[PDB]
Amino acid sequence: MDGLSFVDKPDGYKNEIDQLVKKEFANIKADNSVSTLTNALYTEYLKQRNNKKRRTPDFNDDDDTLFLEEYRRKYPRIDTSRYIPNESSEVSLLGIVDSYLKHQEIVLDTLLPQTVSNQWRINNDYIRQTCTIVEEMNIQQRKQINDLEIYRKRL
Amino acid sequence: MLCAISGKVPRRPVLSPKSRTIFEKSLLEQYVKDTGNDPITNEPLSIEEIVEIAQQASLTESIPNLLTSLQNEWDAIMLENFKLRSTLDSLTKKLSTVMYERDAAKLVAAQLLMEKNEDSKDLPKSSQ
Amino acid sequence: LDSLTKKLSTVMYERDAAKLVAAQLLMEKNEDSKDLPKSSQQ
Amino acid sequence: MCSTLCHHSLPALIEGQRKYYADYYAYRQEIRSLEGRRKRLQAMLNSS
Known part of the structure; x- marks a missing residue:
């Protein structure tokens, strides 16, 4: 678990360790009908066509365009x-909503x-x-090296 | 200022007294009838427990409300949730690659913990 | 979505954290080899 | 990242005691070899 981030001051070591981790991975290897049409529309990438009728129309038509005219x-x-x-209100209604957005x-x-603040505060405690501990490990290693040569010089 | 269910800007916000969180009335009233508990904290909550507590400038070119605006709304709902379902599927796949690589590292450490200390031990024995 | 992202984030961080354990461990293991080899030789 | 650094704190803080305690016991054994090797040297003066 323990790996000191702040204290341990390469990319080669990441590339090295990645390969050893890689080798051990080589070893181990609620809605109704609404949801059906919505998922189908998104999957197919096609929106259902609306009434493109009111915009065009035509004069001297028939009983059909008599309706279409009266609609317009x-x-x-x-x-x-x-x-x-x-x-009537004009820009007052718009600028009142602009204030809400601020x-x-x-x-x-x-x-x-x-x-x-709290993110930097947590990292601050870690530091x-x-x-x-990095000091304590330094203390340990110095003592380690002392024995290593001490035991030799006795023998 | 927002609702804690849909991601709305509520027209009739209502706050629950068990967990201080403002929801839009319709959406909180629906949850309580589905299962009588607070959605966030999973605490007992009823419709009577709730406590009741905006301007949009309709565009100048406001036909479009029936055709163009309504079409865009159900496009934007459709292609987002589909893309959101795509995002949830990959997170679970990328979860499996995370946990496997994690456990792969655990085995390396366990393997190296036996390796290192015994190498150090051998140096201590060498002196003798 | 977000609740799984927490697991993803905590893992990836802890993975590369645990990865640095190996980098350290490997170099110390290596140091033990040459030390003992050069000593056992003489 | 807040929840990351929150988690990183909790798993790291436990790993350190284990790191140290290992090296602590590792140091204790090293001291023993030091503590005995002297005595054999000390017993060179007894024969003289």
Whole structure:
């Protein structure tokens, strides 16, 4: 488990260890009908066609275009009424929503900092641990080398 | 400011008293009837337990609402969840490659733990 | 999706962390060989 | 990354004691060889 990141100051060693890990891997080796049509639409990459009729039409048609004509009138009157209540308020309704979006945005970036601080704070605690033990390991190795030659010089 | 189920910006937000989290009324009311518990914390919660607590500028070119806008909404719902199902499938596959490579490393360490200390032991014995 | 990503992230981090155990271990094992070999020779 | 560094803290903190304790016992054995090798040298003066 133990491998000191802060204390151990190559890419060759990653490439080396990857090969040894690789060799040990060589050894081991809820919705209704809605979901059916939605998954089929996405898989096939084709959206279902809508009513491309109101836009084109034609004068001196028949009973069919008499309907299609009368459709264009009522929707154009609804359109012109739908543009009236927008222009009445105008830009006040738009800029009121623009202000809401600024309150929504700043909240996210506050959380970006809260995460930033606690993430650096955890790493900060790790750092001290790394330097604590890395010294202790240094102490151990020095003592190790002392015996190694001490035992020889006695013999 | 958002709902904690769909990812909406709620029109009638309602907060639960067991876990302080704001949901849109329709979506929290649906969960309680499906299974009577809080979705996040899995704690007992009912419809009576809930406590009830926005402007969108309709575009200038607002026919399109029936045809173009509604079409885009069910395209965007369709191709996202399909792509999201694709993302979930790969995470489980990449999970299996993670755990296998992990256990492969465990065996290396275990194999090397026997190797190193016995090599060190042999140096201690050599002196004699 | 995100709950599996936590497992993915914790693994990949811990994998390459555990990978550095080997790199260290291998070089020490190697050091034990030449040491003993050069000593046992003489 | 927060949950990473959170996890990395918990698994590392336990591995260190095990790292040290191994080397600690490794050191104890090394001391014994040191502790005896002297005595044989010390007994060279007894024969003299």
